[PDB]
Amino acid sequence: MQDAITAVINASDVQGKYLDTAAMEKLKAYFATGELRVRAASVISANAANIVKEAVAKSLLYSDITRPGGNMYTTRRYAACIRDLDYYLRYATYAMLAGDPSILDERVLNGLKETYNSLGVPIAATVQAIQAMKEVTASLVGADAGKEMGIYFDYICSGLS
Amino acid sequence: MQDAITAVINASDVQGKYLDTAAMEKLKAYFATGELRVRAASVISANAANIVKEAVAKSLLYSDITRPGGNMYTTRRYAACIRDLDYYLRYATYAMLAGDPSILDERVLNGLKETYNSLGVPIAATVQAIQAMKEVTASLVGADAGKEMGIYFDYICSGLS
Amino acid sequence: MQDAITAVINASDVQGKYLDTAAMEKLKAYFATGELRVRAASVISANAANIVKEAVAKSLLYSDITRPGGNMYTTRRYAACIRDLDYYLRYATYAMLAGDPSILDERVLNGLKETYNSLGVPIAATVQAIQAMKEVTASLVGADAGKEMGIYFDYICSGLS
Amino acid sequence: MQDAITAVINASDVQGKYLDTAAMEKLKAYFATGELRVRAASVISANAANIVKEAVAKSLLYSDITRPGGNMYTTRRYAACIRDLDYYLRYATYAMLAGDPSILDERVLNGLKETYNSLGVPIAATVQAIQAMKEVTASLVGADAGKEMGIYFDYICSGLS
Amino acid sequence: MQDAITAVINASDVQGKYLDTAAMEKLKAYFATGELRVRAASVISANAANIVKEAVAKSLLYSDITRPGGNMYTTRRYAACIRDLDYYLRYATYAMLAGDPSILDERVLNGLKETYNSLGVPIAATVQAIQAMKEVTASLVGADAGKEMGIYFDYICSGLS
Amino acid sequence: RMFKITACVPSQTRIRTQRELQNTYFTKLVPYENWFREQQRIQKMGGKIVKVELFTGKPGVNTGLA
Amino acid sequence: PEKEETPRFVELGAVTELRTEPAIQFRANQGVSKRREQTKVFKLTDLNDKQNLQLVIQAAYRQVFERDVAPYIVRDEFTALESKLSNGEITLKEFIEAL
Amino acid sequence: SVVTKSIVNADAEARYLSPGELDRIKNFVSTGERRLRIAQTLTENRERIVKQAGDQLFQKRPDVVSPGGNAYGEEMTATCLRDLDYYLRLVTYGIVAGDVTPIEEIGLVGVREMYNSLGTPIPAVAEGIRAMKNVACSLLSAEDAAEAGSYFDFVIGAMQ
Amino acid sequence: SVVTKSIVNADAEARYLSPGELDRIKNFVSTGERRLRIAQTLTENRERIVKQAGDQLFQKRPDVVSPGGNAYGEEMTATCLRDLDYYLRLVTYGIVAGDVTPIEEIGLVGVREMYNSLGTPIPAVAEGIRAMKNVACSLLSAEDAAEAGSYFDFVIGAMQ
Amino acid sequence: SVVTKSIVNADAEARYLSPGELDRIKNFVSTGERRLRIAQTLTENRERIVKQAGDQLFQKRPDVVSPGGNAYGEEMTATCLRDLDYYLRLVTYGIVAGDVTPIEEIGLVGVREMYNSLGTPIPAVAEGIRAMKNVACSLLSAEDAAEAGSYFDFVIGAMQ
Amino acid sequence: SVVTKSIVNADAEARYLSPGELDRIKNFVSTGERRLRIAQTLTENRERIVKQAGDQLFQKRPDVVSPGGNAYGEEMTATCLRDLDYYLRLVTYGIVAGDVTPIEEIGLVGVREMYNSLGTPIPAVAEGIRAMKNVACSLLSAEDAAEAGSYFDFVIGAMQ
């Protein structure tokens, strides 16, 4: 796991130098942006259920996927699908707060490809669903925070695909 | 590559027995059904372009997949997608004529999974497209031949997924 | 794991349909044969050790395999061989009781060929042994039940191949 | 392979938009710096062998690596080392001319770490050598062009790490 | 391939002398006519299809040659004939732009007689046809340019003859 | 025992916009081992075999072949 | 007032997903490798053009031996003269095989 | 089903089916014809059961079909009835299976999570299934009705 | 672009960019401002070019918008104009790139295969792009128009 | 049907079905399975036949769909295509029945009166049915297509 | 001919004909009389097939025979009709041969290049051959007309 600060100091550590003025400038930038990150996290944490609900309705419902034999059909699988969507949103906001995508690659996308292939989950349908999540969450947090949530959502999409 | 006849004689060969009366009954059944297979192949070979056109229109068009950045966007990729659909239909009718799915597994589905994952092709979208092909081709060849084309199309779907 | 009834209702559930008249047919047929299945299971439960005993004697004893350097030699490996035969017979009676071979594939034949190849166990010799079991168990249960046991013993043989 | 202009138009194409004013900005900036890039490329094309010569002398010679048992020892391996440095310098000039690092990633740094680990080549020593090349080439091209060469030499170093 | 500049400097190179003022004069003369050569090339590039069409109609068509048994008969033969005329016109425009007949002499004329005689293609008819091409192209480019082109067309005619 | 050969390769399969004279008419030095295989391939392609010579080697030599 | 609506053709071909750098990096480099069209093919079109002949000889080294052979050879052990301005190995089908 | 449950429980203990289990499956086999008859009646009257039970549900919960309710409008009310239809189908599966395993796995694991994501009220779904149970019992004889009514009872109990 | 083509051709021969190629990219760099200006004009008047060129195309090919034609009806004619819009966008990409590589790869490899699958007439698409070329040239100065008109000419030539 | 044709002819003369009449009935009932298959292909592909034949009709007779024509706008073109669907349905009835009496009773006695009251051009309707015949022949096998083509031919003849 | 193809395959593998390949040529030998009969009726009715099909083609797309069309004027129309006769006798050669190799060699390779050099529209050529196919089908029995139609279909596909 890493942060923007942790990444900066770890890079300087690899070189073996005390924090340079350029490293300090990166750290200062992250500190300047920290308040904006905290605000955005406060917003989507409150609306997490609504974000999942809207995304599911917009892309995953009233289709063959959620009708007999569709992988979202059966209440167990429907619960699992919405649980995965909250997983994605929760880790996306973790990555947004951190300012680093190392969280997503270390946790979310380690073999997630392989699990979904085994389970029979449609990767493309999950990618569509989290794309819808990206649209909703961007609107909630605003444009500048949305383009920060957007990159982490797209990173998850790329890992799935 | 195998046929229904080739599979029957190969099974008897593995046991080391001349063709038993049960083996002869299987062979006789395939001969009885051969004319029906030939008819169905004659039908879809004539309508191969129409089957691909209808399936593409029903599932693959007027969606994000065929609009900028969608994997079917760009004329090169559109040509490749319809070419893959004709590949699937041609091998499906080969398997229908043979009465054996060994053709599909030996040719069509050897690493097709891996190629599509590498290319970035959406497996789910291809499966939807060939499902639409299955509907159109079943209607053309009739119910009894359609349920024979259907199993081979579904075998391709399972290999992709 | 599945049985005949579970398989029928699962197939109907996949196609999103109440139980068909043909599905009701399959259910009736299983119920008609069910009492015969129960009686056969009781018989070979009582004679399980005896069936293994006879089959081992009739193909696996006084042979190059049980003589030194033939894999079945050594008391360890002899115990493992007879235990595997008891496994096969017990899972065959499970499959016969259920009326479905899904148990065999899901719990017995998955990875069994791979393990046997790694261990050095002769897949041909195990197949011969369980065919000997098939003869003995058919004699004990009777002809009608022996047929039913056979379609699952042969299933195990094919998986081993 | 891409360049600055190709990257800008490809990004705009992915988003299905005519060239933005910001995209036009990036294109203008590349054109403003383009003539400087061309002049620098001419300089290090003439002095390519000399740059490799100096860098090899300044970090890779009279050291434990070139003494027996240090990988660079043996005339074969010395020729391979200097050839790799020429590869790195030539691809760095390609990247500088293009204004994009995609060439480095696509043709140089893909699998390079894996091959070096298998061969036993010291990734640290190669990184030190190309940093020496960076100093020499910066002196020859000039300060402005040397910065541009550096952002691609460092890219190669990071890939090697 | 050789051009006016290459011919002048090649003659000086055989002399072993630097560029004389007379050689510079020859280069100046070629530069003087290079302007007209460029626009003539543009004109016949756009009208190349029309030029070949008109020449073929003028001499090749409605003849026993394109009637059965005349060697131009058969669609493949007709396509090859117009392909050769396209070749001749394109090489003629290359020679006209260069101001030198080297391209014709080496790339086209050598071996063409042997291939045509072996295949049975009528060299007299080809010479007549490219003569017709010369007339049409002279009309399109203009008189001065037609003088420039016609010499190369006649050069090809002599090579065929 | 390299064979010097002269041959034609007319092709009806396609009409070629790019240069075809080079492949069409050619002379090549084919070794004795290759000549049967190449002869069969060019004969199958239907090109006329204009000329053959034994560029290297001797017309008949029991041993000491190249 | 003037209505100032968008035309339908704008909406039909507009992607409305707000794609970002990871998505653009992936969606632009989706498909077969770009080295299918970012490559060059060499031909011995004219034995007389010596510049091209040197390029094609070197290219044959690059494909057959996977790298330029100046490292890993004591001396150059290939006579390309039979391929160059001669019919002995005029067939690149023979020069490649000889290598 | 009873057969698959017995096999599972015996496989875990690595024991051939004991006579205590073998008689259980024999009993279920014997009553199979009655079970199939009950399911056949339910599937015959699929559409009547769903239609009139849904009307009863909407009568007892007018808020559900009122504006602002979950099942408001032509298509929304049809999806609500579709869920009732799904549960009837699961009930027929459970009846022929002889246990509640198909009902449980297909439609009662996480039913609350699914319905809360949808915004649907779980108690109102329960009342709809209760109405279906009443209608189905009216279409069955007293012994047949009480045998099937237990599967309905399991469904409503899980809904609560 | 010219830069990427030169780099590709040089990488294959393993040669640093020769001066013959370096001057080519220098020329393209120098005229970049004019190229950007042409593209900026085209993207400004995107909607006018597409609208009136499409009207010209339908005037010259009434069969295309007549009933039974490919682009018949409100949405179908809008997709036809959308294709024209796509080609205009590709043309602007090609203009700033300085070569036809972006146009070729994005929209002219297999254009006939795509359009024949759709059932669309390729020559009519070509005439639509010709109308766009005329309108775009009217919006450019004579030198600017002829520089861009060649990219349009490449597109129509591939369409044929 | 053919059974009705035989029975009507027998009833008129007050005689049990003659052996020849009964022979015809035996042939018809033996051929019934293939008849039902041919009709089933037409019904299953009922949308393709109508859509493609509608396009062919509108191409060949553009006046009906042009403004000022009978089928102008999607509102009225829908009714024209519906009538084409009607006649496909009648043809499937005829294929199953083995006679043109279903077609003639339902939709060929008085077409001249009905369409002349609606204003519709009957020759254009005939073109539409001929287009349906060609499209259906594409879908059907040659031997079967000949049999179905006869019923299509009866319809076009009646409307000429 | 299939005989030619079988020899080519066996020559490629350096094998004498396998019994299956020998059986293929045996079957074609017996089929020869039927194939000759089909070709014989085509040549007997060659004039009638060409004439009415040509008039139908000109009626279909009159721009060909209108001023500005490639076949404007009696001489130009006569030569195009001559081409139609050429292609019909190509199809006769293909019918007796049993494969399309003679048709391809005589008149297909470079079809676009020949007719665009002449300025003739290849889609119009396709419609002309389609008319020839329809007239030929009328003069052939339905069973026989399937065999000749396949060669016609290949030719029109190659025209495109």
Ligand SMILES: *[C@H](C)[C@H]1/C(=C/c2[nH]c(/C=C3N=C(/C=C4\NC(=O)C(CC)=C4C)C(C)=C\3CCC(=O)O)c(CCC(=O)O)c2C)NC(=O)[C@@H]1C
């Ligand atoms: C009806 C008694 C109550 C009610 C329900 C209601 N449900 C939905 C939507 C869905 N219901 C399901 C249910 C299931 N999926 C399953 O796999 C199973 C087990 C077999 C069940 C029961 C699902 C998946 C959906 C999502 C939509 C879809 O199927 O595609 C709605 C629609 C909600 C909306 O606004 O979109 C409603 C209204 N509503 C009521 O008022 C009743 C009390």
Ligand SMILES: *[C@H](C)[C@H]1/C(=C/c2[nH]c(/C=C3N=C(/C=C4\NC(=O)C(CC)=C4C)C(C)=C\3CCC(=O)O)c(CCC(=O)O)c2C)NC(=O)[C@@H]1C
């Ligand atoms: C307009 C000048 C002509 C015309 C065209 C027409 N096209 C379509 C449908 C599609 N067109 C495309 C085109 C492209 N895809 C690409 O990736 C590119 C390169 C950037 C191009 C040019 C595609 C993909 C489609 C499919 C639908 C979709 O985009 O989702 C239609 C609609 C066809 C239909 O009936 O569905 C039409 C009508 N039609 C004309 O009349 C003109 C001559």
Ligand SMILES: *[C@H](C)[C@H]1/C(=C/c2[nH]c(/C=C3N=C(/C=C4\NC(=O)C(CC)=C4C)C(C)=C\3CCC(=O)O)c(CCC(=O)O)c2C)NC(=O)[C@@H]1C
């Ligand atoms: C169409 C339904 C979907 C789609 C496909 C798509 N495929 C490719 C590229 C390739 N596809 C294959 C697959 C096969 N090879 C085979 O031999 C067979 C039959 C046995 C199959 C199915 C391969 C090998 C390739 C790569 C080689 C090639 O160029 O074809 C592409 C990319 C094409 C490109 O990048 O230039 C695409 C887009 N795309 C879709 O959107 C559909 C869902």
Ligand SMILES: *[C@H](C)[C@H]1/C(=C/c2[nH]c(/C=C3N=C(/C=C4\NC(=O)C(CC)=C4C)C(C)=C\3CCC(=O)O)c(CCC(=O)O)c2C)NC(=O)[C@@H]1C
């Ligand atoms: C001996 C004192 C008593 C006795 C023994 C008896 N044994 C057998 C048969 C077998 N015994 C073995 C034993 C071993 N196999 C091993 O690998 C090892 C360790 C190296 C041992 C000890 C085996 C394999 C057999 C099977 C026959 C075979 O070898 O193929 C029998 C025959 C049983 C029969 O009816 O078939 C007997 C009688 N019998 C006595 O009375 C003694 C008390």
Ligand SMILES: *[C@H](C)[C@H]1/C(=C/c2[nH]c(/C=C3N=C(/C=C4\NC(=O)C(CC)=C4C)C(C)=C\3CCC(=O)O)c(CCC(=O)O)c2C)NC(=O)[C@@H]1C
């Ligand atoms: C007897 C007919 C043949 C034979 C058998 C033999 N088997 C093993 C070892 C293993 N067998 C299994 C198989 C199973 N495991 C299971 O759980 C089930 C049911 C679900 C089966 C069928 C496994 C896992 C092993 C390895 C682990 C173990 O020892 O149990 C051996 C031992 C090999 C060794 O040396 O380690 C032998 C000898 N041998 C014969 O000669 C017969 C032909």
Ligand SMILES: *[C@H](C)[C@H]1/C(=C/c2[nH]c(/C=C3N=C(/C=C4\NC(=O)C(CC)=C4C)C(C)=C\3CCC(=O)O)c(CCC(=O)O)c2C)NC(=O)[C@@H]1C
């Ligand atoms: C010698 C007769 C002539 C000569 C040589 C000279 N060599 C160097 C430097 C190096 N030479 C080597 C040689 C080898 N490395 C090997 O692995 C092998 C095979 C086992 C050989 C032969 C190397 C590696 C170097 C680099 C220095 C080092 O070892 O680290 C120099 C020094 C060059 C300089 O300026 O740095 C010289 C002068 N010089 C002569 O005048 C002779 C004609």
Ligand SMILES: *[C@H](C)[C@H]1/C(=C/c2[nH]c(/C=C3N=C(/C=C4\NC(=O)C(CC)=C4C)C(C)=C\3CCC(=O)O)c(CCC(=O)O)c2C)NC(=O)[C@@H]1C
């Ligand atoms: C020099 C700074 C260091 C060093 C290098 C060394 N490298 C190799 C071998 C290989 N290097 C490569 C790398 C590339 N191949 C490429 O095509 C490109 C550009 C796209 C690069 C960067 C490869 C593929 C090899 C292996 C194949 C080959 O021999 O060329 C060696 C040889 C190792 C061996 O013994 O086989 C060496 C010695 N050695 C040093 O000491 C420096 C730190």
Ligand SMILES: *[C@H](C)[C@H]1/C(=C/c2[nH]c(/C=C3N=C(/C=C4\NC(=O)C(CC)=C4C)C(C)=C\3CCC(=O)O)c(CCC(=O)O)c2C)NC(=O)[C@@H]1C
């Ligand atoms: C025909 C339905 C359409 C059409 C054609 C048209 N063709 C020509 C002229 C020629 N056609 C040929 C064709 C062939 N030569 C062959 O060897 C074969 C295969 C055996 C074929 C099919 C040739 C050679 C000519 C050139 C004249 C000649 O024969 O010498 C014309 C005349 C063109 C002119 O202006 O000179 C025309 C009009 N035109 C149509 O409108 C139809 C759609």
Ligand SMILES: *[C@H](C)[C@H]1/C(=C/c2[nH]c(/C=C3N=C(/C=C4\NC(=O)C(CC)=C4C)C(C)=C\3CCC(=O)O)c(CCC(=O)O)c2C)NC(=O)[C@@H]1C
């Ligand atoms: C047209 C004026 C006359 C005619 C021509 C005809 N030519 C060929 C075949 C060939 N022509 C060439 C010539 C060239 N090849 C080249 O690359 C160039 C440019 C440097 C030229 C000039 C060659 C090599 C061939 C043979 C290989 C091939 O097919 O390309 C044919 C075909 C002969 C055949 O049947 O195989 C014909 C008919 N025919 C005429 O009637 C005109 C007088």
